[PDB]
Tab-separated table of C-alpha atoms in Angstrom:
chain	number	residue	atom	x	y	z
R	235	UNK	CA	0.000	0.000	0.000
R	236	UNK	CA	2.962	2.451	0.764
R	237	UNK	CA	4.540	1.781	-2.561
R	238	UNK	CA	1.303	2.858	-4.621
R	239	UNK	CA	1.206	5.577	-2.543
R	240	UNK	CA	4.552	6.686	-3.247
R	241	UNK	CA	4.567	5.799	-6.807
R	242	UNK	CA	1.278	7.663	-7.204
R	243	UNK	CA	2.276	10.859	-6.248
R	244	UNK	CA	5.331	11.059	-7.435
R	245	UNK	CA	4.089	10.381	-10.424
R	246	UNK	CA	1.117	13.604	-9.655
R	247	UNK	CA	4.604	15.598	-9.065
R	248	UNK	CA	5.600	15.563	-12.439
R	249	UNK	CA	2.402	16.187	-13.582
R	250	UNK	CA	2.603	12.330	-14.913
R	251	UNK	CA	0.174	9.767	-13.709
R	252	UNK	CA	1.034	6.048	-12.728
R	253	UNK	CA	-2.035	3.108	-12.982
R	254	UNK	CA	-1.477	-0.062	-11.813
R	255	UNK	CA	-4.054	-1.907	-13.238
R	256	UNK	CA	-2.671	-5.257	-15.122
R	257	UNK	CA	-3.944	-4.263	-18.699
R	258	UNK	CA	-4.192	-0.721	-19.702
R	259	UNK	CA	-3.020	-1.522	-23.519
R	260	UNK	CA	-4.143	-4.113	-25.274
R	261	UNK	CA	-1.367	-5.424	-28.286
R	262	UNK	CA	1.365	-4.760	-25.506
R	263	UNK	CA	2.649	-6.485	-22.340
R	264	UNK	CA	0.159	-5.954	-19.508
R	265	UNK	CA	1.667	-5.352	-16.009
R	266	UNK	CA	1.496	-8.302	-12.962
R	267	UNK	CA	2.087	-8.699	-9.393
R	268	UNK	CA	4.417	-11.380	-8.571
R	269	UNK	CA	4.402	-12.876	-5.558
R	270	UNK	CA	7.155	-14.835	-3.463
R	271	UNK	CA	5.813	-16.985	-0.862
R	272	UNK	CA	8.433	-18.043	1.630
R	273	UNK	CA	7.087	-19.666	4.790
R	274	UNK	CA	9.737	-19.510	7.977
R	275	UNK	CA	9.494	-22.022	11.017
R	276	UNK	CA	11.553	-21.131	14.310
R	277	UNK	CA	14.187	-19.307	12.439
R	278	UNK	CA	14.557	-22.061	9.212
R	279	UNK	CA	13.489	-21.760	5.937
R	280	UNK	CA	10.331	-24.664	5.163
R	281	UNK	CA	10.495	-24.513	1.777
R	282	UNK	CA	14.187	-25.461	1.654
R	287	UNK	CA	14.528	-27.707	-7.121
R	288	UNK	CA	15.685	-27.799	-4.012
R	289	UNK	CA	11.917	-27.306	-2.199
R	290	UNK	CA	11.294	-29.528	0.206
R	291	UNK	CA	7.816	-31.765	0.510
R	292	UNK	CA	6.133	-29.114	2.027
R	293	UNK	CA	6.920	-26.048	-0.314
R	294	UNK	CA	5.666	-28.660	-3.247
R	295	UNK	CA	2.251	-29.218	-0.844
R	296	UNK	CA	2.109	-25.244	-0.873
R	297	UNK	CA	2.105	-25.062	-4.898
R	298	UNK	CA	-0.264	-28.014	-4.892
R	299	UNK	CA	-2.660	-25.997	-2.707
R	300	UNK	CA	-2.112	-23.458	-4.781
R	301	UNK	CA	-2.731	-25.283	-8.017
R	302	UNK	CA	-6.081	-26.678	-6.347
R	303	UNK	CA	-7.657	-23.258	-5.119
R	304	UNK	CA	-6.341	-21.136	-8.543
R	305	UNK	CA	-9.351	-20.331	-10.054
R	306	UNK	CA	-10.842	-19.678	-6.321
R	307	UNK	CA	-7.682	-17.856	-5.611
R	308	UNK	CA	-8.548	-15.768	-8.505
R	309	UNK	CA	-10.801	-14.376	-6.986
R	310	UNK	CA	-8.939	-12.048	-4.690
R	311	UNK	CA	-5.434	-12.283	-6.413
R	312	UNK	CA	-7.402	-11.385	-9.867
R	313	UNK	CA	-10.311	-9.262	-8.057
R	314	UNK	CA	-10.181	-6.854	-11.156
R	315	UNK	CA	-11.854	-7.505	-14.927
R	316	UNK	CA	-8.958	-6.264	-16.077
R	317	UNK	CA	-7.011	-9.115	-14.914
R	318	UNK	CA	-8.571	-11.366	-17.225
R	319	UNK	CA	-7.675	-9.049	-20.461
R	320	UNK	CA	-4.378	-10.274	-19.475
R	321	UNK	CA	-5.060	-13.946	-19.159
R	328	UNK	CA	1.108	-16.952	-17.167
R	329	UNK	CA	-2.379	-18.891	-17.150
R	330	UNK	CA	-1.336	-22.461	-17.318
R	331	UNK	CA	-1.583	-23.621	-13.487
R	332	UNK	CA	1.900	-25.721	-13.717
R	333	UNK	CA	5.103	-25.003	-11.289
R	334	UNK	CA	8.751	-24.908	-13.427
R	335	UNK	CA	12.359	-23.716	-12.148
R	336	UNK	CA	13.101	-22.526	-15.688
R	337	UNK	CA	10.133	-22.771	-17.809
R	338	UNK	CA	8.524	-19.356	-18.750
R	339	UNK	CA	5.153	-20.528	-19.681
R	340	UNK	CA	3.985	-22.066	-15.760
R	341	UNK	CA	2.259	-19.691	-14.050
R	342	UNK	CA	4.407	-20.497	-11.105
R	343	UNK	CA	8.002	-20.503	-10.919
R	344	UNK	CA	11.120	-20.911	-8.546
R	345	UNK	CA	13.827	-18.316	-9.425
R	346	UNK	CA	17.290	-19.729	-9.060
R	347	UNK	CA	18.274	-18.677	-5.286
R	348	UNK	CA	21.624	-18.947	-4.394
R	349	UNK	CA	21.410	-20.068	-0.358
R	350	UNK	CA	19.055	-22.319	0.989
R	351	UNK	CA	17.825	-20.091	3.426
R	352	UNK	CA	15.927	-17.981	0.943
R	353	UNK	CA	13.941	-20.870	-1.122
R	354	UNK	CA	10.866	-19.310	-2.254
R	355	UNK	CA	8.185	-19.548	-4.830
R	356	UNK	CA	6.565	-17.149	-6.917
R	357	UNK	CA	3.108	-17.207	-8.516
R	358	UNK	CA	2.742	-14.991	-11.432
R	359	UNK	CA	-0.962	-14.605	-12.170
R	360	UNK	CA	-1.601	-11.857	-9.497
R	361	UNK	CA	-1.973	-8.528	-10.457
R	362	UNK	CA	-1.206	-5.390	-8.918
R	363	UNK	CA	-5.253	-4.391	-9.119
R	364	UNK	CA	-5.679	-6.843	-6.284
R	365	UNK	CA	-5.968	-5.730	-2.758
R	366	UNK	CA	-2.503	-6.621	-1.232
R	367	UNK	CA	-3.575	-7.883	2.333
R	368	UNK	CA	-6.639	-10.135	0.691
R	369	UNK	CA	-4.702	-11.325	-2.504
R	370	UNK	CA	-1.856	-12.394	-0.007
R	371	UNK	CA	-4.521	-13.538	2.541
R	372	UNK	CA	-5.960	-16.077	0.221
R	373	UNK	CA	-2.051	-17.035	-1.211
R	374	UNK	CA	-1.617	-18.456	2.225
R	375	UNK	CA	-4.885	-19.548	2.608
R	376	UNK	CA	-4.234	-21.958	-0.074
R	377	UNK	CA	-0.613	-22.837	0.580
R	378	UNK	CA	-2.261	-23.914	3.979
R	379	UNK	CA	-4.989	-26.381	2.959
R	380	UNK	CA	-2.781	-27.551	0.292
R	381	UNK	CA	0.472	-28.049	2.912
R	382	UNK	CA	-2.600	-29.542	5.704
R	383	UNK	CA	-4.001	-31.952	3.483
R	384	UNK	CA	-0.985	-33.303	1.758
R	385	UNK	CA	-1.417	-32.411	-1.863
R	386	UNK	CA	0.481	-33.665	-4.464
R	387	UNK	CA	1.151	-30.945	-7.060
R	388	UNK	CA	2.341	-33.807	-9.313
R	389	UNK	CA	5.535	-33.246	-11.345
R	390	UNK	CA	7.291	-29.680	-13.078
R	406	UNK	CA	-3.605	-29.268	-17.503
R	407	UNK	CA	-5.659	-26.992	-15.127
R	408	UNK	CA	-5.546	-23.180	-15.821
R	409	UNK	CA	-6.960	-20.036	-14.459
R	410	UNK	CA	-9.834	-18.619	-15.134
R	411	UNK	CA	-10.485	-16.354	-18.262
R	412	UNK	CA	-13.040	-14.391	-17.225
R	413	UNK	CA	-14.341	-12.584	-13.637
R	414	UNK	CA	-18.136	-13.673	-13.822
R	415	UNK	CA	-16.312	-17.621	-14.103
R	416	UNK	CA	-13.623	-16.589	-10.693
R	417	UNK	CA	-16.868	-15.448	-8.812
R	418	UNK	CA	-18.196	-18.682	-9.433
R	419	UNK	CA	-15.493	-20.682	-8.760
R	420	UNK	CA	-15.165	-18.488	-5.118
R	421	UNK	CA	-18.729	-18.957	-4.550
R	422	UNK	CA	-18.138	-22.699	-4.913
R	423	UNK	CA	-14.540	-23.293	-2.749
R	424	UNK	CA	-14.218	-20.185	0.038
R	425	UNK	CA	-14.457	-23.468	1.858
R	426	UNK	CA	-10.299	-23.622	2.838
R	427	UNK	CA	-10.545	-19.895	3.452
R	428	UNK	CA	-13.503	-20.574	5.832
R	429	UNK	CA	-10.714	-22.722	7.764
R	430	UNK	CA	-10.100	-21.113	11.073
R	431	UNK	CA	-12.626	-18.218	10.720
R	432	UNK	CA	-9.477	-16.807	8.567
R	433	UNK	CA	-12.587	-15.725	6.297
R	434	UNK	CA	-15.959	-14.955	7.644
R	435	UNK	CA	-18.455	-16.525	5.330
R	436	UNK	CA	-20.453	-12.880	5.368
R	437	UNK	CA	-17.260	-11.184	4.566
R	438	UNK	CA	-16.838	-13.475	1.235
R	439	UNK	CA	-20.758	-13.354	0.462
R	440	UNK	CA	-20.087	-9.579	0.834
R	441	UNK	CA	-17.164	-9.279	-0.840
R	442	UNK	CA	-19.115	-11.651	-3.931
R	443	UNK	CA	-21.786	-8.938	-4.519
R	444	UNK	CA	-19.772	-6.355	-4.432
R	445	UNK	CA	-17.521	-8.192	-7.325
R	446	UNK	CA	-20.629	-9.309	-9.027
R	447	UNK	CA	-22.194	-6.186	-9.188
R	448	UNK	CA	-18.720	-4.314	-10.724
R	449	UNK	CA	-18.650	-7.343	-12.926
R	450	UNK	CA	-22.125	-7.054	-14.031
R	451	UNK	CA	-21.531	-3.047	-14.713
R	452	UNK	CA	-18.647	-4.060	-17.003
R	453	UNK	CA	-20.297	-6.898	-18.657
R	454	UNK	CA	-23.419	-5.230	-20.139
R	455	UNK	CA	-21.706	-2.352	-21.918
R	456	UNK	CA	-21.089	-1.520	-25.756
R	457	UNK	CA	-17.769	-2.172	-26.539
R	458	UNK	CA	-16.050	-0.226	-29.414
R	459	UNK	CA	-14.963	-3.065	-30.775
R	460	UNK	CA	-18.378	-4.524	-31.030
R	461	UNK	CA	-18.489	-1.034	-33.666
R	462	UNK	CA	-15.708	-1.895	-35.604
R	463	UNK	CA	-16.991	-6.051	-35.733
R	464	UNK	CA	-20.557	-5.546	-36.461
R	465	UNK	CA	-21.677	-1.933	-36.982
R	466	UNK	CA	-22.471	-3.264	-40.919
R	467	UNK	CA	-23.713	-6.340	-39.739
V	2	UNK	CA	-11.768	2.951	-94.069
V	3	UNK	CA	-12.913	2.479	-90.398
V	4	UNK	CA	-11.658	5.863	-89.269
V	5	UNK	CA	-13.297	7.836	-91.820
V	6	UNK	CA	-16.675	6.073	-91.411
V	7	UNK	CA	-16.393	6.862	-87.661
V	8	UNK	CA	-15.274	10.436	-88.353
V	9	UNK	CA	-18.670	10.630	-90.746
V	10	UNK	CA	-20.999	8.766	-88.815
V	11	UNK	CA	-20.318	11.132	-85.502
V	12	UNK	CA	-18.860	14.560	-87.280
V	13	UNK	CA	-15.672	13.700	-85.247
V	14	UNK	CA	-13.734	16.962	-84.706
V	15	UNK	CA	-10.156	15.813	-83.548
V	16	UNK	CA	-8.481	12.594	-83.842
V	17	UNK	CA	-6.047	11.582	-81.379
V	18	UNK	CA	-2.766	9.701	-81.972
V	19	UNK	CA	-2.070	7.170	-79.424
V	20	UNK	CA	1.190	4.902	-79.270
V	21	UNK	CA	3.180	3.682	-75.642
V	22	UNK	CA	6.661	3.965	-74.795
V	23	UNK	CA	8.535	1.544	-73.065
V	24	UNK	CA	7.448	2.442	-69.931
V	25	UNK	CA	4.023	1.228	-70.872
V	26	UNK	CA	2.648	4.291	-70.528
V	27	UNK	CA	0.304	5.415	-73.040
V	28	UNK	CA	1.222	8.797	-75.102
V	29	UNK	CA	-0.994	10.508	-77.422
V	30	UNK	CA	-0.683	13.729	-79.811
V	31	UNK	CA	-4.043	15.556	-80.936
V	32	UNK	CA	-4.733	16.984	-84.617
V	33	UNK	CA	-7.710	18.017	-86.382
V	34	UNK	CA	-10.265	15.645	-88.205
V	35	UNK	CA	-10.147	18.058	-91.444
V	36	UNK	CA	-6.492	16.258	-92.467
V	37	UNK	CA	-7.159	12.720	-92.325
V	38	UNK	CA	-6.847	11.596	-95.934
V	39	UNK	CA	-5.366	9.110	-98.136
V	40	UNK	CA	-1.468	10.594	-97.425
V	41	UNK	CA	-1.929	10.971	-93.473
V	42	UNK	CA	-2.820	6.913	-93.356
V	43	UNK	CA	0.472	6.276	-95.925
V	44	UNK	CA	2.792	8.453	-94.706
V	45	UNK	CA	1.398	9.335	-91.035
V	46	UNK	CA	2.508	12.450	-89.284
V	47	UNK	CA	6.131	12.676	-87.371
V	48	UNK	CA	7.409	13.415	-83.883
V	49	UNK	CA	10.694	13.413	-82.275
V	50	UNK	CA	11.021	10.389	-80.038
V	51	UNK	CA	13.969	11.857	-78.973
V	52	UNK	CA	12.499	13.086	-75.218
V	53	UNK	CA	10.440	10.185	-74.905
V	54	UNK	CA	11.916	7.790	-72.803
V	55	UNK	CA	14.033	5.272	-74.746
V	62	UNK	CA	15.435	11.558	-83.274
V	63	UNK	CA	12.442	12.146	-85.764
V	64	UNK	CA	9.925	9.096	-86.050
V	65	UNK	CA	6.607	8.561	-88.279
V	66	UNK	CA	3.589	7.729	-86.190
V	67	UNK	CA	2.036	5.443	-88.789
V	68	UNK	CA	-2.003	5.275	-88.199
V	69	UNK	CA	-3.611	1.725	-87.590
V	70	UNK	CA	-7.071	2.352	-88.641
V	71	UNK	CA	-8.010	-0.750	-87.560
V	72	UNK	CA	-8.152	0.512	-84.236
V	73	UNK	CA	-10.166	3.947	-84.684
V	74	UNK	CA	-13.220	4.350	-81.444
V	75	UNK	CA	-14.794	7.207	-80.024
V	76	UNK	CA	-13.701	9.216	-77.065
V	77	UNK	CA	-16.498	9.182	-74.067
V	78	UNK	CA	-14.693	11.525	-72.084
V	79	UNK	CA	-14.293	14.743	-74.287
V	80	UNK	CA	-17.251	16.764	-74.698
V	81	UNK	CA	-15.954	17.574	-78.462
V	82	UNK	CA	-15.738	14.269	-80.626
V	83	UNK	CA	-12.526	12.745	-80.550
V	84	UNK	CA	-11.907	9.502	-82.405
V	85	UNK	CA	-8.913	7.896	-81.014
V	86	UNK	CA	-6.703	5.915	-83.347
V	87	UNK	CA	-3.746	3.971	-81.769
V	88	UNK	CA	-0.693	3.820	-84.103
V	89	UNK	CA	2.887	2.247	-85.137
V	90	UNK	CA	6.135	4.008	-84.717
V	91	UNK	CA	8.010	3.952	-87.978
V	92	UNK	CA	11.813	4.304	-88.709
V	93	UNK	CA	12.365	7.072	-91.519
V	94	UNK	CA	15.629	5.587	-92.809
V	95	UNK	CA	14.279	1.633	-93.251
V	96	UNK	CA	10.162	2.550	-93.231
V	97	UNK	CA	10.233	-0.657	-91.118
V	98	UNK	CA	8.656	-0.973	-87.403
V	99	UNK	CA	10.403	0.540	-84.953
V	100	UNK	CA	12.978	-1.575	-83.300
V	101	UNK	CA	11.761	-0.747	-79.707
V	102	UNK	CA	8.448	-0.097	-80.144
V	103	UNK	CA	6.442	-2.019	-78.103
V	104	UNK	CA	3.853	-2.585	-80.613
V	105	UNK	CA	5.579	-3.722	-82.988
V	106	UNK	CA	7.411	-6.370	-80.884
V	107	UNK	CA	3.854	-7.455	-79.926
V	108	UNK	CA	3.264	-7.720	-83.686
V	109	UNK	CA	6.676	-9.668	-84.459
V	110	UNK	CA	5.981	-11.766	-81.746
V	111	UNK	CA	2.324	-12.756	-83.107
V	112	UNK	CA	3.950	-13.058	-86.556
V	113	UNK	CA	6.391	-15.769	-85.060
V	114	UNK	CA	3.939	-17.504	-83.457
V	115	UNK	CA	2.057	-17.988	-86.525
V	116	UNK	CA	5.678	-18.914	-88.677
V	117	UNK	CA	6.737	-21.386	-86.170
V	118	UNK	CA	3.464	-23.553	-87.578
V	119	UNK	CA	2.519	-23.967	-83.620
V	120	UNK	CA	-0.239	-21.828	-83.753
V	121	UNK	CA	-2.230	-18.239	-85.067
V	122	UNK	CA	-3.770	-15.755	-82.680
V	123	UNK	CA	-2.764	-16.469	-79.720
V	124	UNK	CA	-5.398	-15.267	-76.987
V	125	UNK	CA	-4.510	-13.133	-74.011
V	126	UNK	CA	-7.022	-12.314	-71.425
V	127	UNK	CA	-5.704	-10.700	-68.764
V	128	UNK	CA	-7.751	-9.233	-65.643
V	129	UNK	CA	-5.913	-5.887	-63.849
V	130	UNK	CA	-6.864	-4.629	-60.722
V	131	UNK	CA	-7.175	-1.110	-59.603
V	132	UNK	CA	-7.217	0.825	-56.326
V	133	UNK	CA	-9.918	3.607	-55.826
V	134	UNK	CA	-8.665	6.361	-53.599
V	135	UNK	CA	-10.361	9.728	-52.263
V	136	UNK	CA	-6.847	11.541	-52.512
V	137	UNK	CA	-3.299	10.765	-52.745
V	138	UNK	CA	0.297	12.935	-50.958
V	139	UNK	CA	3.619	12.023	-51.367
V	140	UNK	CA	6.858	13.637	-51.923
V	141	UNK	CA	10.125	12.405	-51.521
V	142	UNK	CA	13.389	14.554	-50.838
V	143	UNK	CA	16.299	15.431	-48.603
V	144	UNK	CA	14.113	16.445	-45.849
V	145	UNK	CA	12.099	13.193	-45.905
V	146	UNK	CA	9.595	11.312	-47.618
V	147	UNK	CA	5.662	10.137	-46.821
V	148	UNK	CA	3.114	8.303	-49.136
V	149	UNK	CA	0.365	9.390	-46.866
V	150	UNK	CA	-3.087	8.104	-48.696
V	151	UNK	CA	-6.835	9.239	-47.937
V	152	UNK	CA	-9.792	7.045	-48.657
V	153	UNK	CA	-13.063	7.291	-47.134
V	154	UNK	CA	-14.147	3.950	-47.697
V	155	UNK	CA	-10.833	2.661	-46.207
V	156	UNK	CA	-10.284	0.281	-42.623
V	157	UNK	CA	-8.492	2.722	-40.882
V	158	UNK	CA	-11.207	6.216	-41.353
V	159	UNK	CA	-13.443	4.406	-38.854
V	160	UNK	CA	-12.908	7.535	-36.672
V	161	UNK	CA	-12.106	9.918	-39.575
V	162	UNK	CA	-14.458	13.466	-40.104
V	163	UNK	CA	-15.763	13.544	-43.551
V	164	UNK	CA	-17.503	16.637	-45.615
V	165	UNK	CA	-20.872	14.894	-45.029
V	166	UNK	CA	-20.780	12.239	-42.258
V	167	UNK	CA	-18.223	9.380	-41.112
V	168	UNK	CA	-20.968	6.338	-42.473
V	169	UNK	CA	-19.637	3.777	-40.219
V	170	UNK	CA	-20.472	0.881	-42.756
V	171	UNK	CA	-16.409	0.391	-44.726
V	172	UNK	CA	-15.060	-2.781	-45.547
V	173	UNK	CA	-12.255	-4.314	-42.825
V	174	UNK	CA	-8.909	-4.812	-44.120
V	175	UNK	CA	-8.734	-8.170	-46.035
V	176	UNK	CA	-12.761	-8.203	-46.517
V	177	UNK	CA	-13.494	-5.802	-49.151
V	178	UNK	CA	-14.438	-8.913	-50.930
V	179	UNK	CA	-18.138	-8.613	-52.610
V	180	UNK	CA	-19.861	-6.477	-49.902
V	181	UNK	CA	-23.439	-4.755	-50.569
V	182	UNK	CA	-23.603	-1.341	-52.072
V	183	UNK	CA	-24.216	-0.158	-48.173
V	184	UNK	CA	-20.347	-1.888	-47.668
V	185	UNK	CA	-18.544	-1.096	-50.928
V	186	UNK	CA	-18.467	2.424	-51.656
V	187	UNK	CA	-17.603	2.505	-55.541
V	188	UNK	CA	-20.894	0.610	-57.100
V	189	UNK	CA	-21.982	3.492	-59.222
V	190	UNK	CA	-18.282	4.611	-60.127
V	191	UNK	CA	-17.379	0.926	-61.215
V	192	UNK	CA	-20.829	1.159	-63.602
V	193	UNK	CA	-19.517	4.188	-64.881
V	194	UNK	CA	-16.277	2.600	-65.727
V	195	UNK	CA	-18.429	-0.241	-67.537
V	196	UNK	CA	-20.075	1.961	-69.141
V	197	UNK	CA	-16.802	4.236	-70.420
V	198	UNK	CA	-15.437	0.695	-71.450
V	199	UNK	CA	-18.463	-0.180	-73.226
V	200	UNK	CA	-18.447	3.169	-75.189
V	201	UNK	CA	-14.814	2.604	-76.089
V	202	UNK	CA	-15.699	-1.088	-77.494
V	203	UNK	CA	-14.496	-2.633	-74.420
V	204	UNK	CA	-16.810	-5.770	-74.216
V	205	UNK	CA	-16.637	-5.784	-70.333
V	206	UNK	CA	-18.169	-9.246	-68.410
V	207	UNK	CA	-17.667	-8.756	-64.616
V	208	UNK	CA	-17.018	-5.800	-62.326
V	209	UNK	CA	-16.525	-6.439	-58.510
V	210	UNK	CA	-14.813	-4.827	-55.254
V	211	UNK	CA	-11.728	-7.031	-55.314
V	212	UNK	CA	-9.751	-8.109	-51.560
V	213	UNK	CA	-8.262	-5.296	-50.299
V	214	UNK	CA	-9.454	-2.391	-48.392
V	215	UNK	CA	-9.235	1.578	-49.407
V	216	UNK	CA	-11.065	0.944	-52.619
V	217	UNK	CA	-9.814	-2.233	-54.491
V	218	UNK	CA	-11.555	-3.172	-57.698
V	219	UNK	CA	-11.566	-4.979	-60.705
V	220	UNK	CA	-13.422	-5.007	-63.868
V	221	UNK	CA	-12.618	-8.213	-65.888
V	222	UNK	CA	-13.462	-7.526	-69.772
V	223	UNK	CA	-13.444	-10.145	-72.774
V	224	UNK	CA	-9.861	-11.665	-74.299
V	225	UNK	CA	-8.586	-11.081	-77.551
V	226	UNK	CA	-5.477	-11.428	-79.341
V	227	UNK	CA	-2.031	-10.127	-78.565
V	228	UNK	CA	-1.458	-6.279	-80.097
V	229	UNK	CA	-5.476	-6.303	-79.787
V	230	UNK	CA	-5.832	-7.079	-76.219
V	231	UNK	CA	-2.658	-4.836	-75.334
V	232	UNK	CA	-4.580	-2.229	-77.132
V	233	UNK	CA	-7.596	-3.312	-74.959
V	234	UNK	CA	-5.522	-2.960	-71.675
């Protein structure tokens, strides 16, 4: 939150102006909000590719929940004009939408997931990372080996939200009112988006 | 002959001399109707080829080729001709015409065949306006076409009509679509006055105005002619 504030007005200094939505342009690269997820215990690094069992149960909770994850990490219609989808973990590869950069020490073995944006609220979006990463490291999940993807559109990550809040209902982490809340609130933004002309619409089918 | 029926039949008032260059672009000289006669189809008139690109030269009259002019208000009878060497009286050597000619006189030697058909089918762009210059400061080709893909936003003397053909699908749309249905009739019926015996006219692939008018085949110095 401090960093869009500062980045906001410096840019207002200059008379410039700084958005951090994660597709302003469309034919160009859109903007995204990594995130590294390193859980600590007593000190040590957990996830010490080099991750241990549990750090592999994190991505597989991760992998599990995406599209419900989406929901908060991708809280934006704009996140989807962007849609990094394929929900696969790689140390190299480029095209999984999570990856583990090449650390030098074990004490800093991380992971990153790359389908956040910066749209999303920082404190839910990294709320619901850990949510995951929790049911996924509780309940032993398998992420397999280095297909399911994210979802494509926000009406389809409401729905998907709607149908598993149940991990983030784990604890009272979530209140269930909060999420139903939070779900109209989306729904109705969603629905305001949805049912408006689109100039491309004009340049597809004005003669038609 | 031909010509001088024409010239009767419509009081034609100026005949124009038409030959090409190498360039394939056509060239053509104007003189009055009152001195066509026996000596101006033997002898022709003369010009200096000189400044044309590629001295003195007869333009020799092919009268087999005389039609009207539907552009000029005053009646013009168009007759396209052969470019004659003084010194041998022979074709020219680089007339394009009259290598057309040699080559439909081989064809018809080498015993493998006689008028050999040609029908070829051109197309054209249609544009509003055209810029373009091209110097030490810097060069542009800029191009303006109200019926083309990218004025979807443009301000026109009369209205932006939203209705243009997308770029790669100005293939047969409606008259709504395709802005040049009346203008490609007029060019039938220009073609039609010249003797052109035209047989399809459509708005061809491309955006900004693309059409073609496919007209009847014929043989080679004929259909040249014809194009």
């Amino acid at each position: 939150q401090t960093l869009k504030y500062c980045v906001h007005n410096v840019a207002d200094a200059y008379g410039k102006t700084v958005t951090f939505m994660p597709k302003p342009l469309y034919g160009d690269n859109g903007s995204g909000m990594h995130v590294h997820m390193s859980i600590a215990k007593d000190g040590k690094n957990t996830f010490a590719a080099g991750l241990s069992d549990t750090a592999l149960y994190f991505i597989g909770g991760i992998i599990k929940h995406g599209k419900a994850l989406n929901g908060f990490t991708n809280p934006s219609t704009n996140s989807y004009k962007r849609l990094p989808v394929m929900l696969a973990y790689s140390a190299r590869n480029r095209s999984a939408s999570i990856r583990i950069p090449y650390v030098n020490s074990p004490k800093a073995r991380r992971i990153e997931a790359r389908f956040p944006d910066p749209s999303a609220n920082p404190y839910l979006a990294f709320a619901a990372l850990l949510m995951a990463g929790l049911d996924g490291i509780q309940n032993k999940i398998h992420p397999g080996d280095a297909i399911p993807q994210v979802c494509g559109s926000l009406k389809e990550a409401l729905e998907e939200l709607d149908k598993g809040r149940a991990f983030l209902t784990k604890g009272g982490v979530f209140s269930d009112d909060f999420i139903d809340a939070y779900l109209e609130l989306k729904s109705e933004e969603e629905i305001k988006v949805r049912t408006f002309v689109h100039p491309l619409e004009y340049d597809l089918y004005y003669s038609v | 002959s031909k010509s001088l029926q024409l010239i009767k039949e419509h009081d034609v008032k100026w005949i124009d001399l038409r030959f090409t260059d190498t360039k394939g672009k056509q060239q053509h000289v104007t003189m009055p109707a009152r001195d066509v006669d026996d000596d101006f189809f033997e002898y022709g008139k003369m010009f200096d080829g000189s400044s044309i690109a590629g001295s003195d030269m007869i333009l020799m009259p092919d009268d087999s080729t005389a039609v009207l002019d539907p552009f000029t208000e005053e009646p013009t009878l168009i007759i396209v001709c052969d470019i004659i060497e003084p010194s041998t009286m022979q074709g020219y050597d680089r007339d394009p015409r009259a290598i057309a000619r040699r080559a439909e006189e081989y064809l018809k030697s080498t015993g493998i065949g006689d008028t050999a058909f040609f029908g070829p089918e051109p197309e054209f762009f249609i544009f509003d306006e055209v810029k373009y210059k091209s110097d030490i400061s810097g060069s542009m080709f800029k191009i303006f076409s109200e019926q083309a893909a990218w004025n979807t936003d443009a301000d026109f003397e009369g209205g932006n009509k939203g209705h243009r053909p997308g770029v790669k699908g100005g293939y047969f749309p409606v008259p709504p679509v395709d802005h040049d249905h009346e203008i490609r009739t007029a060019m039938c019926n220009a073609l039609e006055e010249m003797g052109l015996k035209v047989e399809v006219h459509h708005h061809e692939v491309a955006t900004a105005g693309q059409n073609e008018i496919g007209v009847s085949f014929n043989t080679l110095v004929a259909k040249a002619d014809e194009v």
